[PDB]
Amino acid sequence: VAPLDLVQPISDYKIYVSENLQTLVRDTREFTNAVKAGDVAKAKKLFASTRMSYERIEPIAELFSDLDASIDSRADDHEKAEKDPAFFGFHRIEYGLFAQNSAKGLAPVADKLMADVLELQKRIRGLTFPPEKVVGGAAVLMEEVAATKISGEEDRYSHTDLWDFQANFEGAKKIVDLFRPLVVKDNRAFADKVDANFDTVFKTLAKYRTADGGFELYGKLSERDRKVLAGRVNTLAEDLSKMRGLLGLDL
16 A cells, blocks of 8 residues: 555545535534524424534544534533533533523524534635544544443433434544555455444444434433443444554554
């Protein structure tokens, strides 16, 4: 494997990120308009679907710690928790809509979120995507899901965590898929093992689909369920880390 071999995959990855950003902008516009209209039931309905595009590219948003924090911090990232005036973004709005069943006071929060998402899109368009950052960032995202979000930390009021996880896994799987042509060369066995390990995690989430094809609230996963999911998601982190080395990226 040589650096030229990685150029096309990264170019396709940037298109994928750009497309998710376009979707995030459109969906965030509809979401923030519903909040600003005071349409709680509609903003609630759009919360997790809007966030999927963000969670699919989450490591990239992670590069702009203040943007990303602005867009997606949790209450416990703040001294006054939910009543901290520095609590903006999706989860500030989540608190109003789901915990308080109210849009009051959220119009300015929605304004800031729209602006931040537009600004994130702008910054990402100008980024060069080093392949070791793409693959290694995906590995870290898997470990973060397994080891830091497994208790439902992300969506403390809506409990829409499963939608976030699905999108995280989709985004990591896209990176695996883009690099498969390089990998099946000398390591078809490994490339198929990774596909199988992702399959296992996706099938694990499918246990918690509902009758109409949505997701259960995260509280429906037992402690056993969570421990087992965390182990299987760890295998994904391993896989992505090993893939980094197999792509020549450790020099």
